[PDB]
Design an enzyme around this catalytic site. Structure first.
Site: not given
Ligand SMILES: Nc1nc2ncc([C@H](O)[C@H](O)CO)nc2c(=O)[nH]1
Ligand SMILES: Nc1nc2ncc([C@H](O)[C@H](O)CO)nc2c(=O)[nH]1
Ligand SMILES: Nc1nc2ncc([C@H](O)[C@H](O)CO)nc2c(=O)[nH]1
Ligand SMILES: Nc1nc2ncc([C@H](O)[C@H](O)CO)nc2c(=O)[nH]1
Ligand SMILES: Nc1nc2ncc([C@H](O)[C@H](O)CO)nc2c(=O)[nH]1
Ligand SMILES: Nc1nc2ncc([C@H](O)[C@H](O)CO)nc2c(=O)[nH]1
Ligand SMILES: Nc1nc2ncc([C@H](O)[C@H](O)CO)nc2c(=O)[nH]1
Ligand SMILES: Nc1nc2ncc([C@H](O)[C@H](O)CO)nc2c(=O)[nH]1
Lengths: 121, 121, 121, 121, 121, 121, 121, 121
Positions: E22, E54, E73-74, E100
């Site tokens: 992977e 954001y 993923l942790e 995933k």
């Molecule tokens: N929390 C939050 N963040 C934001 N960031 C950007 C923009 C704007 O639409 C454009 O992306 C940048 O000009 N609006 C927001 C918003 O309403 N809330």
């Molecule tokens: N709880 C838990 N289980 C997991 N199992 C497998 C993998 C591996 O990185 C791959 O997805 C598959 O081997 N990561 C995790 C994980 O982070 N958390």
């Protein structure tokens, strides 16, 4: 003869558009591409030499989509179509669909776009 | 003769694929099989002996995706395309489509693969 | 000439419909407009004057659904089918489709309506 | 000539099936029906007398679907097709698609089915 | 204080995973992070400085997922957490959910993941 | 400790159910899972040995569902909940849900189903 | 009193946003609403006068969104939350969420957005 | 005791609503009821008598929605509540959620509804 290599739903982030703010902000660009190719040989053998790698075709679609900004979708599609039909003599026809479900069009719709169909000669 | 018998979204977890890691970890393949066959008799009577057990077709298409791994998806289509064509002469045309929403390819897209159309011989 | 310019899922809240209650409470109509027009020039150049402002088309199709109520959906399609055909001669073919997922009809179904295909005159 | 009246996604609960347990338990039955009708007149006038009421067509589809149990989908479709083409001389062609995403087929698929196409003579 | 700022559906294609296979193929990862902020002033004043951009938040997640290769993923979520926690005195808690959709497990499922909830100190 | 390891929408074609027929037909069983696992040092180290490999959990849910038939979903969720509870001390609490999207019920719904929540003892 | 009157996914094509461009392009703003209304005798009698007509609430959210442009979603949610709070004593608490599925952000996500929760004073 | 039995996505086409127009046209209603039961014994013994037949639960909701015409969703859910509460000493709480996807309000939204939570005494 109706075998077809497909690449459906390829979505990229392009700044294409006839607007000025668009070519500034950009937006996701959906692209569907089906290629008229015969997979009878490919199918019989099971070897690449008998078809078009959908990965290469992906990248070519990719080059044009995030490449320089264009104005219409006709541009982006006509460029993909001639990048596909001029790179593979295996592809009889190459239709390109490009949707923009994010245009500066005040309303509610599942997206606007075009869809070209080009053969090779 | 524009009639058909279909089976869509058949999901099979096969270890096919050109790369070594694919057949090493495997992924989902989404088969769509469309068979072109006169249904007038079948509908006129109402007995499978007049049509094609589409449940059978599953097991037939399925014995190709869970079967022996391979490289080209076109293979997988051909193997199913042939198996279904042969075991049934009533099947005028066969459409085997196989999608890979998860092939190893950097990028967002909903899925890819190829489509092939076969007739009966 | 297999090229097209599309606009899908256009949602408009019109009070159309044969019954009196419909135009009384109204509902959602889902327009899908597909125009058939050569995009070679447009894509070759890259200037709307070579294609059809699909954003314009919205407002055109939209001035028919939010416009004057009526009975038949075919009307609504014709009104849009004509308006778009006329104001643009480049438009070879016009496909106006209007869906009603919510018409007053006891039953489960995802949607209904009609589809019509028009050419330019 | 490519205008089309559509009824897509009509889902009913039928006990049809070639099995015995099926004709016992039943299951939802998806049915798509597109009717080759010309809406140029309907479109020009805006009167029913110029087309087929999609509500009547719905019910006819409805009669056959929840009617007596049948064995194949060919039956249900061939009966809808001849109920549609023998009731409206306005419908040149009537194709019927019936999906069963709930068959007794051990696997994963988005459903199996058939799809007939019948014209009128 | 149930106000929130979120980024649901963040899709990144990385080579993360505890299996080298992977780590070679990679896979689309999906993440959702919902920030616990107080949008009071931002609400009246309307000054972005009274909130958390954001888009800048999306960066900190992009850098982590699009970054080096990792095992769990942790961890992917571990750097996500603090990365934002440390950069914005504005957010009280960083809730990260990682999925995933197409893991290296043979079967049919929505997706697999974890979700951690970290605040600020 | 709000953490968890979730396994959404695992779909198994089981022959279970309270109807002797169902057990001959078969049908998909969609399973949701959510084990509460203290993923503190699991993310710390990045050694799955310090956490639960969902994959194993999947194959353990699989052995249940693809096993021999029973009547209730409750017994299925329990043979599953029991499996996990008696394999991972890591899991503070287990949570099984087995939706039913195709049971013998004349009606329209997205499904019916039970969900249980067991802890370890 | 866990009750509520919810208005999910209200989509308005607003010209708001922190970017001067956005305000020229425009984009859909999806709004979620959830007013906590003690629906005890509202269900008792069956007189809407003993509860909040969501419709009015909708048109009040509409006046906001289709109004003139602002920069934050927070000001939008507040001009909305404020509207409800100052119109229905019925509403113990208001809850606005304004997702953003098309903002200027080079990335793939299902959207970003804030959500606020105001009570009455 | 977080165990549950549910019927998510129940769709019924009734003529409910406080407006005579909607009382004439009718509309697809969507309901979800999640029962609070203890699936302990049902789990080990596997005897339906140790649980609540959801199919019989679907009835009690079918009778109410498919029944007479009413004014508010509140009532529709009011009879749903007790109807089950009184019929099954097995369930501790009846949680009913009712949605009106296409109400008589001009606009674009997911749906509108209410959700009540009633236990047993
Ligand atoms: N929390 C939050 N963040 C934001 N960031 C950007 C923009 C704007 O639409 C454009 O992306 C940048 O000009 N609006 C927001 C918003 O309403 N809330
Ligand atoms: N709880 C838990 N289980 C997991 N199992 C497998 C993998 C591996 O990185 C791959 O997805 C598959 O081997 N990561 C995790 C994980 O982070 N958390
Ligand atoms: N083929 C094609 N047609 C177009 N029409 C209008 C606009 C404008 O930027 C806006 O969408 C209208 O609001 N862009 C395009 C476009 O890129 N391609
Ligand atoms: N035409 C065609 N192109 C292909 N390109 C790449 C791969 C690879 O096995 C993986 O999907 C992506 O790494 N398979 C195929 C294929 O079967 N057919
Ligand atoms: N062909 C055709 N059939 C129709 N049947 C019923 C209705 C009604 O107005 C409502 O949709 C349902 O009550 N409209 C139409 C229609 O426009 N076209
Ligand atoms: N056309 C058509 N073909 C069929 N093939 C098999 C079965 C069986 O009942 C099962 O689905 C196979 O498991 N039913 C049908 C059917 O109704 N129609
Ligand atoms: N709570 C609960 N109720 C059930 N009711 C019916 C059936 C059976 O599959 C068939 O519908 C009737 O034979 N299974 C269940 C079940 O697992 N759990
Ligand atoms: N909170 C709340 N608001 C409502 N608004 C309108 C209607 C009407 O029956 C129709 O939907 C439209 O007039 N019912 C209700 C309702 O039960 N609860």
């Amino acid at each position: 003869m109706q075998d077809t290599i497909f690449l459906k739903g390829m979505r990229f982030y392009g700044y294409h558009g006839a607007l000025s703010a668009e070519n500034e902000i950009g937006q996701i660009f959906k692209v569907d591409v089906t290629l008229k190719v015969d997979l009878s040989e490919a199918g019989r053998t099971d070897n690449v030499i008998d078809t078009v790698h959908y990965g290469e075709v992906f990248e070519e679609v990719k080059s044009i989509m995030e490449g320089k900004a264009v104005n219409l979708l006709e541009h982006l599609a006509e460029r993909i179509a001639n990048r596909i039909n001029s790179q593979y003599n295996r592809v009889m026809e190459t239709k390109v669909r490009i949707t923009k479900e994010n245009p500066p069009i005040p309303g509610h719709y599942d997206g606007v776009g075009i869809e070209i169909v080009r053969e090779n000669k």
